[PDB]
Amino acid sequence: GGSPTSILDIRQGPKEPFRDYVDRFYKTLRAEQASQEVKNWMTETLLVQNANPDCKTILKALGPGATLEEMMTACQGVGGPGHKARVLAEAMSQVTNTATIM
Amino acid sequence: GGSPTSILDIRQGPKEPFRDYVDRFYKTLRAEQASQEVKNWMTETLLVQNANPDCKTILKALGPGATLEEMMTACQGVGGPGHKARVLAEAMSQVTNTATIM
Amino acid sequence: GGSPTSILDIRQGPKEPFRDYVDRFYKTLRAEQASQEVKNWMTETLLVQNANPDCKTILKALGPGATLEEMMTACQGVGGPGHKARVLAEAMSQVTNTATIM
Amino acid sequence: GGSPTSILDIRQGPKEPFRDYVDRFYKTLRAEQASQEVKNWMTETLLVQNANPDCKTILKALGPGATLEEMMTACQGVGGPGHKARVLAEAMSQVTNTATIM
Amino acid sequence: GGSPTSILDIRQGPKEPFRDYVDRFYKTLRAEQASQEVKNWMTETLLVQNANPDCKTILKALGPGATLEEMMTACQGVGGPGHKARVLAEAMSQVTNTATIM
Amino acid sequence: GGSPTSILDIRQGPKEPFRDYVDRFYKTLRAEQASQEVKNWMTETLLVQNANPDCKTILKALGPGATLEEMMTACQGVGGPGHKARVLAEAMSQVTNTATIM
Ligand SMILES: O=P(O)(O)O[C@H]1[C@H](OP(=O)(O)O)[C@@H](OP(=O)(O)O)[C@H](OP(=O)(O)O)[C@@H](OP(=O)(O)O)[C@H]1OP(=O)(O)O
Numbered sequence A, B, C, D, E, F: 001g002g003s004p005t006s007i008l009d010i011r012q013g014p015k016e017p018f019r020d021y022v023d024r025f026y027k028t029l030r031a032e033q034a035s036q037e038v039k040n041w042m043t044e045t046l047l048v049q050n051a052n053p054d055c056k057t058i059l060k061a062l063g064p065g066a067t068l069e070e071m072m073t074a075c076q077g078v079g080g081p082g083h084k085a086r087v088l089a090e091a092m093s094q095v096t097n098t099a100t101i102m
């Protein structure tokens, strides 16, 4: 848990899909000198807390227990027309004062 | 699916079009050591399911039976002027006047 | 009909303009092993049909019979100016005030 | 006239600035086997006809006969911040309140 | 302090996440011949000063006293889909309804 | 000034930040066969004139006489989130209600 270059800071870019970054988690997990028990624990636990709020909001929202594959399906929505069209459509409609935050 | 690399997850990014990714689906199959029955099965089932929600929403809109050409013509507009044109407006114009979601 | 790499997939992108793709048409046709007329036939039937809804919506707009020299001229602002510009301001104003679709 | 690659298709892309294309007009022409007068005619004539609507229309704003430098001074804004802060950025608010086009 | 290529200008892009830039910051902080205190000192004071105003405002916002990790985690939310979603939502309506600036 | 490639056309792109271009300005100067004074004159007079309107509107605003460090800091915001958030947000809200230009 938190091996050199692997968990202490592996981080998904704001424009970096969950795809490359998660792989950065897998391949770097291969690149670290971790025990088996060491990597499996790293994956579930850190992968979420450190990855791009677009998807981090999806890892937590899916609700824990979501199969990794499902995290991928959900994070695949990360993206412009899919995830951004909603974050731009939503954030803009809250400031449209039927529901603006004061 | 599940064959090595080719069809476990072959994914379509948000900016990667349905066009370029098709090759990712097929050309990557050229790499898996799978029977033709194994591959053609993959071309259909794993394609629509693990590829780009802008397009998937179109693969299930066109629906099954759509030749790849049908999934091609419609998903061609995936992108800003074609799809984002219809995507920004759908969420923006919905939540604002009548489709406001509480 | 499309011989290998010729008219089966010569497809334009959603970010790629009629300038780059049009070249793909002719060039990849040089790599095809087809009859002379096949190439001339290929352009009229496939090009307009399997090419990027930006240039495709322009092409129909041109009205068939517009020389390739003319299609080039027409689809030049494809890409951010001609096309992506006109497109955002329209969808935004059609669905919103009068052309609102229920 | 236009010898192969020189003036028949030297064109400025859509996202492309007058900078990169002007370099092309100035690059490909060297590759042309034209007469000294012909080339002089080529810049003033073909540079404006086939140079990017962001910046082309600019050449119309400056207007014909302007010094090439001025063509650059006014076509420097083409591209994300300068040109676009002004054109569609305005079109968003034009078609909306007073400039609504039926 | 401030050695060549190290801190005299080590600067992050407008969009560059604090990570890519920092891969520079750290790598070059290690390449300059600075005393253990000189470098360490630089990693504190300069890291916040010469870095992408998006992330810089975040840095100040977290407030000093937060672990370095927090400085970059917060800046990991710098952004296209995430940070920009929040900023775009607010700026547009700030000026429009209450925060109108004359 | 006016030596080949150095100050006649050294230009900042539209998406290119004040950093990359300034670098073109400084590096290209090394290429010109100018007197030491000649280059100094060149950095002040031209750097502000043929450099990307975002930063150019900033350079004038800072006010001449500002150190290169001052042009650098102020123009670091050139870019999307920092400079575009403000430009679009303003133009959009100026044209709309009170600052509508006839
Ligand atoms: O012109 P294209 O090659 O089709 O791509 C552009 C370009 O993006 P790039 O940075 O990749 O060249 C714009 O960049 P600018 O030069 O305008 O900064 C970007 O602008 P933003 O970063 O501000 O979004 C714009 O998007 P838009 O037209 O929404 O301004 C995007 O076009 P696409 O999103 O349509 O691919």
Ligand SMILES: CC(C)(C)c1ccc([C@H](Cn2cccc(C(F)(F)F)c2=O)NC2Cc3ccccc3C2)cc1
Pocket: B080, B081, B084, C079, C080, C081, C082, C084, C085, C088, D014, D015, D016, D053, D054, D078, D079, D080, D081, D083, D084, D085, D087, D088, D089, F084, F088
């Ligand atoms: C607010 C700002 C970011 C500055 C802005 C505003 C709108 C434009 C464009 C309109 N416009 C403006 C200038 C130059 C061109 C070019 F170079 F691309 F031709 C052009 O198309 N229209 C986008 C095309 C497009 C594509 C995808 C999503 C939105 C838009 C609007 C670009 C930038």
